[PDB]
Amino acid sequence: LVPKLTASVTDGAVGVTVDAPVSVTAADGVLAAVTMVNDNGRPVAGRLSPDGLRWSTTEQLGYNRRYTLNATALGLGGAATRQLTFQTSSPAHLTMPYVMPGDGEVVGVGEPVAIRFDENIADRGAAEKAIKITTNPPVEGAFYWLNNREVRWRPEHFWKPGTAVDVAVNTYGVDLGEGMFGEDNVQTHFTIGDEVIATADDNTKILTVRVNGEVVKSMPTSMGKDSTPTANGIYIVGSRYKHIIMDSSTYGVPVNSPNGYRTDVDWATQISYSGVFVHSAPWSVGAQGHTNTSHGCLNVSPSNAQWFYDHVKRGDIVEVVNTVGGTLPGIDGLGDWNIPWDQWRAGNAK
Ligand SMILES: *C(=O)[C@@H]([C@@H]1N=C(C(=O)O)[C@H](Sc2c[nH]c3ccccc23)[C@@H]1C)[C@H](C)O
């Protein structure tokens, strides 16, 4: 019997995707030599199996390449040689994904998986299928898009403390629609820490911090005045700042417009993309616990703001109740939990 050569690609092929390695296998014989070179002649890194039956590329294959594969199989029954030339995907565009939270970070029970592309994604389903989420203990979750570039993944309920979460965004070589391909793969891993939920009740004007169910802090607060109220609902804690200049035009509002502003504040914890913060407000300490005076922020004392900075982490939860405002938008950026599970689970890939 003459040896048989079988490659993972065909000699005519074009649009060969680079999301997977190229391989060659021998039957009724072993692989004596396999080389693969690109256009100019540079050989691709590859390794042969110990039993000599299978060879495969070991480095990343490039977009817009013309590769030529040469293989020889030897067996008792004789020899066989093949030569194959193929062309890989040529993207009209590349997009790079960015993942949050950071690798190795410990976050609160409200932290969603966040994958943000630097380009609009024409084929949302293709992107979702390219993203592998591992959870331990395993929990059901689903993808939901906040906009054309950023997709979120979360369970039905807040994470259980101690849960490991692994995120592999494998979009290299993947057609993301309209000739858009992934620029590279990214992978992050994070862990869920203590359950921290802080509740702001407009009926008491108190911000109560509960850690695993126990009250550890009760902060008098001043929230949004009736003119610019604080929206009710569930807020996810984002970034924290020892100090930050608060610019209204960052959130749409022109600085010298009626409800515009530019002020420098201390100990600020962001809880919405729309610009709601927990922060130090020495000017309204008399009002805190009594009357709402803010532009929507949860004003607290300088001491309590620093405490919040020190003790609350990314992914922890702030819940606002009983204000004269509406409900925080589900697609705010930190308002994901306000979307009903039935709607989130359904997703919006189409
Ligand atoms: C949140 O409300 C808002 C942020 N929080 C501030 C506040 O104190 O309400 C400022 S605006 C302000 C209103 N009265 C003041 C007196 C002295 C100094 C500043 C202010 C600022 C708008 C978010 C972050 O935009």
Per-residue DSSP letters for 257-271? STT--EEEEEEEEE-
Name which residue sits closest to atom 18 of ligand 1, judged by CA: 263
CB 336 within 8 A of CB 112: yes
Alpha-helical segments (H) within 172-222: none
What's 229's DSSP letter? P
Contact 295, 261 (CB under 8 A): yes
- Buried b / exposed e across 125-163, counting CB within 10 Å, b at 16+? ebbbebbebebeeeeebbbbbbeebbbbbbbeebbeeeb
Quote the CA–CA distance of 244 and 269 in Å, as a whole number. Answer: 10
User: CA torsion sign, 237 to 319 to 268 to 260?
Assistant: positive
CA distance 168 to 155: 17
Question: What is the location of CATH 2.60.40.3710 in the chain?
Answer: 90-193+336-350
Q: How are beta strands 317-321 and 196-201 bridged, if at all?
A: parallel
**DSSP assignment, residue 41?**
S
CA-wise closest residue to 107 among 307, 316, 319, 317: 316
C-alpha neighbours within 13 Å on the C-beta side of residue 269: 25
Helix H or strand E encompassing 28: none
- Name the residue with tokens 């020889």: 72
Could you give the CA distance from residue 271 to residue 159 in angstroms, rounded to a whole number? Answer: 18
Output the CA 297–ligand 1 centroid distance in Å. 7
Nearest 5°: phi and psi at 322? 70, 20
Phi and psi at 270, nearest 5°, equal: -75, 130
290 is known as an active-site residue: no
Q: Is 93 noted as a catalytic residue in this protein?
A: no
- Catalytic-role residue among 93, 189, 290, 297: 297
Q: Which residues of 234-260 are buried (b: 16+ CB within 10 A; e: fewer)?
A: bbbbbebbeebebebeebebeeeeeee
Output phi, psi for 214, to 5 deg.
Answer: -95, 135
CA end-to-end span of the chain, whole Å?
A: 53
CATH number assigned to the domain covering 194-335: 2.40.440.10
**Total Cβ atoms within 10 A of residue 124:** 18
Nearest to 307 by CA among 191, 211, 235, 234: 211
Asked whether residue 348 is marked as a ligand-binding residue, the answer is no
Contact indicator for 161, 193 with CB cutoff of 8 Å:
yes
Which one of 93, 157, 189, 279 is the catalytic residue? 279
Q: What 3-state class would DSSP assign to 236? A: strand
Resolution value (Å, 1 decimal)? 2.0
Question: How many helices (H) and strands (E) would you count in the chain?
Answer: 3, 26
Radius of gyration of the chain (CA): 27
Q: Which ligand 1 atom is the nearest neighbour of the CA of 284?
A: 8
Compute the distance between CA of residue 160 and CA of residue 192 in angstroms, rounded to an integer: 7
Residue to probe by mutation, ligand 1, list 207, 295, 334, most atoms within 8 Å of CB = 295
For 135, the 3-state DSSP assignment is: strand
Tell which residue, 154, 171, 165, has the closest CA to residue 98. Answer: 171
Beta bridge partners of 132: 168
105 is in an annotated binding site: no
Identify any residues that bridge with 239 across adjacent strands, giving them in sequence order: none
The three-class DSSP label of residue 245 is strand
Q: Report the C-alpha gap between 180 and 178 in whole angstroms.
A: 5
In this structure, the number of other CB atoms found within 10 A of the CB of residue 41 comes to 7
For residues 126 and 110, the answer to whether their CB atoms sit within 8 Å is no
| Cβ burial, residue 64 (10 Å; 0-12/13-18/19+) | exposed
CATH 2.40.50.140 fits 90-193+336-350, yes or no: no
Amino acid at 48: L
Q: How many angstroms does the Cα of residue 157 sit away from the middle of ligand 1?
A: 33
Q: Would you say 181 and 91 are in contact if contact means Cβ atoms under 8 Å apart?
A: yes
Instruction: Report the C-alpha gap between 29 and 179 in whole angstroms.
Output: 41
Peptide bond before residue 3 is cis, with ω within 30 degrees of 0: no
Structure letter (DSSP) for residue 178: T
CATH 2.40.440.10 residue ranges for the chain: 194-335
Backbone angles phi, psi at 343, to 5 degrees: -75, -40
Establish whether 178 is an annotated binding residue: yes
**What is the 59 CA–ligand 1 centroid distance (Å)?**
53
Q: How far apart are CA 224 and CA 325, in angstroms?
A: 9
Q: Which of 321, 279, 286 is nearest to 304 (CA)?
A: 279
CB 318 within 8 A of CB 271: yes
**Measuring from each residue's beta carbon to the nearest atom of ligand 1, which residues come in under 6 Å?**
246, 261, 263, 275, 277, 281, 283, 294-297, 299
Residues ≥6 apart with Cβ < 8 Å to 126: 174, 175, 176, 177
